[PDB]
């Protein structure tokens, strides 16, 4: 019924540290501490027994060694390496592969995480409201250009538009069928997704029938809109993702945000 | 051997070979892309309207119908990315090669489209 | 009109990012398959070409289409010969395929373009290899002279002449050629006809084949009652292959999904041969003829049958695991327009190894001065002899270290 997922990979976007075969992205000393310590702490706080960790074709034992040595958890961890991933798809292809192991609801948490917010209250929220998908947003630095688009609705807290500004069309693009329903919408410019994901049981069947998932963000949560015509049959509450805002400093790392985390730490 | 080569080289050397863009009058009242000015575009560039629609479809996943002059295309598409698309279609689906000319007419020549220039009369590939 | 098949093999080699496949296509006609389940497996080039000369001198005679209506001749061309082209990549990494081509080849084609530096190592290496593997018939071609001025080309030619002086091969014709213009092919054909003497074709020793591309030739949604065998598109080295032979696929596939590597080779029987347009009983070697063997369509997909070899019941291709390589190292690393000295090998590291016709990843087991043993994840094999090109991880993409010899 209850299970947690840990996603692991290898760096490609960052400039420097990762080129060596011996040292991966999973075991990095930012400030005399491993990067995955925080995740472990979070998991401990949450209290869960069955946790399955996914890993690519590269590094098969190093991660295990890291898990073993130094480190508190005292839980049973299981690590697997499927040989189908080619980096060019990250975790969607893993998800598609592993399905009979899933019993109930599952929590998705990647390796790249810095956390300070209360842990259990997200889970509790997910449990209470009874929805398919949940994601979180945190503001960019205020202390001394186009980034990415988000929309918020509040009276229940729901997500409407989450498409990024990579291959951005010069004018604003929405839909009026998604606008006439929910007449009030607030445009967010500063907020950024911090890779926090919660998912339910009614998603396992759709993956085998129709594969459409991309980058775990582009089309993982984006197929939800039941507007205009509707042709695809739903599996048996309307298919809608949720979004909640937070004040405290907890952020992601992907682009040019690695030296700032150190600064944040040392004060 | 280095005697019959110079002649060959010589032979090789011997054998060697826009204001038409209309202003798009479109307001950004979205949900469905409405192009009312497209008839003018079709006229000026000497084109059938359907081909442009097909091109648009190919470019981005859309579904609609032809109406006499005006288009009802599903999607909240703008007047700058659509403009970009239009520009693109006017650099690889209108321009020639042998001779750069103004007047290019459309002819349905059997299922795949092949257009002809009015100035000279040459068959050009219209698919990419 | 009934047409004969290929007897003489012509091979085209050069340098990476210059264009060889395109040239081959221009020469022959039909587009090649290489570069999900069909077409792609490993970098190669195959297409059918016709030798039909019309004599009723100069250069212009040959045409692409069987019906001739271009220069000004109403009648049909006289029967001369037929050719099938095998194209091999001119990469420092992809040398195994080139080597394989070499043993087959009766006619060679070299390409130098007027855009890069005059002294070239890879070309020299290729030449050396050619010299080694009992070959004399070499033809030099010029790739691109379209953007060149007037004297630069001449200078380049002079440089080339200066370079080719202290070599075994001397009897070589030089032709300036184009790929995109669809002209200057007739002259090439004429050259091919006149300069090279008829190679005394023979079938003995030990028939050998090299499958580069794998195909599942069927309609999308084929019925149970009517099913065609798995066509293995492979270039035949030597020995005439006919209908009625027991074939084995040598390297062996990983079937357990702990992992064992030691396994028996997979056996298959020939059903039908595909060449030119019409079906033929016999197959004269020197071309990538599609051999339809009793193999399942599920096996012939993408990144599993990369350069797997085909031989008759009992031969010498043979299966291999870690592989036995005797390497010769260069002084300094070549390829950069920063230079570093060649270091000794380190145990347990992922490196790419190219032997025979394969391009697969491998892991290092033992460290020695001249010899090396490597473990393979995806199927690999070796033909008669053929050299080895090693590629190692230094910065992001793979880089060359030097050439090698197989001791088996």
UniProtKB/Swiss-Prot annotation, chain A:
Modified-residue entries (Phosphothreonine), positions: 225
Domain of life: Eukaryota
Coiled coil regions, renumbered to chain: none
Protein's cellular compartments: Cytoplasm, Cytosol
Residue numbers of Phosphoserine PTMs: 215, 219
Extra information: Present with 9530 molecules/cell in log phase SD medium.
Family of the protein in this entry: Belongs to the eIF-2B gamma/epsilon subunits family.
Function: Acts as a component of the translation initiation factor 2B (eIF2B) complex, which catalyzes the exchange of GDP for GTP on the eukaryotic initiation factor 2 (eIF2) complex gamma subunit. Its guanine nucleotide exchange factor activity is repressed when bound to eIF2 complex phosphorylated on the alpha subunit, thereby limiting the amount of methionyl-initiator methionine tRNA available to the ribosome and consequently global translation is repressed.
Assembly, per entry: Component of the translation initiation factor 2B (eIF2B) complex which is a heterodecamer of two sets of five different subunits: alpha, beta, gamma, delta and epsilon. Subunits alpha, beta and delta comprise a regulatory subcomplex and subunits epsilon and gamma comprise a catalytic subcomplex. Within the complex, the hexameric regulatory complex resides at the center, with the two heterodimeric catalytic subcomplexes bound on opposite sides.
Name recorded for this polypeptide: Translation initiation factor eIF2B subunit gamma
Organism, as annotated: Saccharomyces cerevisiae (strain ATCC 204508 / S288c) (Baker's yeast)
Highest classification ranks of the organism: Eukaryota, Fungi, Dikarya, Ascomycota, Saccharomycotina
Name of the encoding gene: GCD1
Residues of the full protein shown: 2 to 413 of 578
From Swiss-Prot, chain B:
Family: Belongs to the eIF-2-beta/eIF-5 family.
Subunit structure, as described in the record: Eukaryotic translation initiation factor 2 eIF2 is a heterotrimeric complex composed of an alpha, a beta and a gamma subunit. The factors eIF-1, eIF-2, eIF-3, TIF5/eIF-5 and methionyl-tRNAi form a multifactor complex (MFC) that may bind to the 40S ribosome. Interacts with GCD6. Interacts with GCD1. Interacts with TIF5/eIF-5. Interacts with CDC123.
Chain's role: Component of the eIF2 complex that functions in the early steps of protein synthesis by forming a ternary complex with GTP and initiator tRNA. This complex binds to a 40S ribosomal subunit, followed by mRNA binding to form a 43S pre-initiation complex (43S PIC). Junction of the 60S ribosomal subunit to form the 80S initiation complex is preceded by hydrolysis of the GTP bound to eIF2 and release of an eIF2-GDP binary complex. In order for eIF2 to recycle and catalyze another round of initiation, the GDP bound to eIF2 must exchange with GTP by way of a reaction catalyzed by eIF2B.
Chain intervals annotated as zinc finger (C4-type): 96-120
Compartment(s) where it occurs, according to its Swiss-Prot or TrEMBL record: Cytoplasm, Cytosol
Name of the protein this chain belongs to: Eukaryotic translation initiation factor 2 subunit beta
From Swiss-Prot, chain C:
Annotated region described as G2, given as residue ranges: 39-43
Top EC group: hydrolase
Region ranges (G1): 14-21
Binding, GTP: 17-22, 143-146, 178-180
UniProt miscellaneous comment: Present with 20800 molecules/cell in log phase SD medium.
Protein biosynthesis listed as a keyword: yes
Outcome recorded upon mutating residue 212 to L: Mildly impairs eIF2 complex function. No effect on cell population growth
Gene Ontology MF terms in the entry: GTP binding; GTPase activity; methionyl-initiator methionine tRNA binding; translation initiation factor activity; translation initiation factor binding
Entry keyword annotation includes Protease: no
Keyword line: Cytoplasm, GTP-binding, Hydrolase, Initiation factor, Nucleotide-binding, Phosphoprotein, Protein biosynthesis
Organism: Saccharomyces cerevisiae (strain ATCC 204508 / S288c)
Region (G3): 87-90
Compartments, record wording: Cytoplasm, Cytosol
Disulfide links within the chain: none
GO cellular component entries: cytosol; eukaryotic 43S preinitiation complex; eukaryotic 48S preinitiation complex; eukaryotic translation initiation factor 2 complex; multi-eIF complex; ribosome
UniProt effect for mutating residue 175 to R: Abolishes binding to SUI3 but not to SUI2 or CDC123. Abolishes interactions with the eIF2B complex subunits GCD6 and GCD7
Disruption phenotype: Inviable.
EC number per UniProt: 3.6.5.3
Subunit annotation: Eukaryotic translation initiation factor 2 eIF2 is a heterotrimeric complex composed of an alpha, a beta and a gamma subunit. The factors eIF-1, eIF-1A, eIF-2, eIF-3, TIF5/eIF-5 and methionyl-tRNAi form a multifactor complex (MFC) that may bind to the 40S ribosome. Interacts (via C-terminus) with CDC123; the interaction is direct. Interacts with GCD1. Interacts with the eIF2B complex subunits GCD6 and GCD7. Interacts with methionyl-initiator methionine tRNA.
Modified residues (Phosphoserine): 152
Swiss-Prot/TrEMBL catalytic activity: GTP + H2O = GDP + phosphate + H(+)
Domain of life: Eukaryota
Result when mutating residue 39 to K: In SUI4; defective in ternary complex formation, correlating with a higher rate of dissociation from charged initiator-tRNA in the absence of GTP hydrolysis
GO biological process: formation of translation preinitiation complex; positive regulation of translational fidelity; translational initiation
Listed name of the protein: Eukaryotic translation initiation factor 2 subunit gamma
Gene: GCD11
């Amino acid at each position: 019924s209850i299970q947690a997922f840990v996603f692991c990979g290898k760096g490609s976007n960052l400039a420097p540290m990762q080129h060596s075969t011996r040292l991966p992205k999973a075991l990095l000393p930012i400030g005399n501490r491993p990067m995955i310590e925080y995740v472990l702490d979070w998991c401990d706080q949450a209290d869960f027994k069955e946790i399955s960790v996914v890993a690519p074709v590269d590094e098969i034992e190093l991660i295990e060694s890291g898990l073993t040595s130094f480190l508190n958890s005292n839980h049973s961890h299981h690590l697997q390496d499927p040989k189908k991933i080619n980096f060019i798809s990250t975790g969607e292809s893993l998800q598609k592969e592993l399905l009979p192991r899933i019993n109930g609801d599952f929590v998705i948490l990647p390796c790249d995480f810095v956390t300070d917010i209360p842990p259990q209250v997200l889970v509790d929220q997910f449990r209470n409201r009874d929805d398919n998908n949940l994601a979180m947003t945190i503001y960019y630095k205020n202390s001394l250009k186009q980034q990415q688009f988000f929309t918020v609705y509040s009276e229940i807290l729901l997500d409407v538009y989450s498409q990024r500004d990579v291959t951005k069309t010069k004018y604003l693009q929405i839909r009026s069928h998604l606008l006439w329903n929910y007449p009030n919408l607030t445009v967010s410019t500063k907020l950024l997704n911090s890779f926090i994901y919660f998912c339910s049981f009614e998603l396992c069947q759709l993956l085998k029938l129709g594969p459409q998932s991309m980058s775990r963000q582009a089309s993982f949560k984006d197929p939800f809109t039941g507007n205009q015509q509707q042709q695809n049959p739903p599996t048996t509450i309307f298919i809608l993702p949720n979004e909640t805002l937070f004040i405290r400093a907890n952020n992601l790392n992907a682009y040019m945000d690695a030296n700032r985390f150190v600064l944040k730490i040392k004060s | 051997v280095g005697l019959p080569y110079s002649e060959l080289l010589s032979r090789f050397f011997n054998i060697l070979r826009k204001f038409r863009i209309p202003p798009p009058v479109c307001l950004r009242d979205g949900k469905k892309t409405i192009f009312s000015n497209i008839q003018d575009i079709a006229e000026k560039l000497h084109r059938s309207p359907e081909h442009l629609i097909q091109y648009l479809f190919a470019e981005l996943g859309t579904s609609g119908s032809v109406d006499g002059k005006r288009l009802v295309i599903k999607g909240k598409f703008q007047s700058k990315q659509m403009e970009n698309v239009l520009r693109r279609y006017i650099l690889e689906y209108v321009t020639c090669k042998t001779c750069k000319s103004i007047n290019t007419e459309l002819k349905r020549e059997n299922r795949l489209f092949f257009m002809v220039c009015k100035s000279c009369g040459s068959t050009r590939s219209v698919s990419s | 009109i009934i047409n004969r098949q290929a007897t003489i093999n012509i091979g085209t080699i050069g340098h990476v990012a210059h264009g060889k496949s395109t040239v081959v296509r221009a020469i022959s006609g039909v587009q090649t398959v290489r570069f999900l389940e069909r077409n792609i497996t490993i970098k190669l080039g195959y297409a059918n070409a016709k030798i039909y000369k019309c004599q009723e001198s100069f250069k212009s005679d040959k045409e692409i289409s069987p019906k001739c209506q271009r220069p000004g001749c109403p009648g049909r061309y006289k029967l001369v010969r037929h050719v099938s082209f095998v194209d091999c990549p001119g990469h420092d990494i992809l040398m195994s395929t080139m080597l394989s081509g070499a043993a087959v080849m009766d006619a060679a084609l070299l390409l130098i373009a007027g855009n890069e530096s005059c002294p070239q190592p890879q070309t020299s290496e290729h030449l050396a290899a050619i010299e080694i593997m009992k070959l004399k018939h070499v033809i030099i071609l010029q790739n691109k002279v379209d953007l060149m001025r007037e004297e630069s080309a001449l200078e380049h030619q002079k440089s080339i002449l200066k370079f080719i002086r202290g070599t075994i091969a001397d009897g070589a014709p030089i032709v300036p050629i184009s790929a995109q213009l669809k002209y200057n092919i007739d002259a090439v054909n004429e050259f091919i006809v006149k300069t090279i003497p008829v190679p005394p074709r023979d079938f003995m020793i030990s028939p050998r084949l090299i499958v580069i591309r794998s195909f599942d030739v069927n309609k999308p949604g084929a019925e149970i009652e009517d099913l065609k065998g798995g066509v293995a598109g492979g270039s035949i080295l030597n020995g005439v292959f006919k209908l009625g032979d027991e074939i084995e696929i040598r390297p062996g596939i990983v079937t357990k999904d702990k992992g064992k590597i030691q396994c028996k080779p997979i056996f298959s029987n020939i059903v039908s041969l595909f060449a030119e347009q019409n079906d033929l009983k016999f197959a004269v070697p020197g071309g990538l003829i599609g051999v339809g063997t009793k193999v399942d369509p599920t096996l012939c997909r993408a990144d599993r049958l990369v350069g797997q070899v085909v031989g008759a019941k009992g031969h010498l291709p043979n299966i291999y695991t870690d592989i036995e390589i005797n390497y010769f190292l260069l002084r300094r690393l070549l390829g950069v327009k920063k230079q570093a000295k060649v270091r000794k090998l380190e145990p347990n590291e992922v490196l790419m190894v190219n032997i025979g016709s394969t391009a697969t990843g491998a892991r290092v087991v033992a460290v020695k001065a001249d010899m090396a043993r490597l473990q393979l994840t995806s199927p690999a094999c070796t033909e008669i002899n053929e050299k080895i090109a090693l590629s190692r991880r230094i910065e992001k993409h793979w880089r060359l270290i030097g050439w090698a010899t197989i001791k088996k």
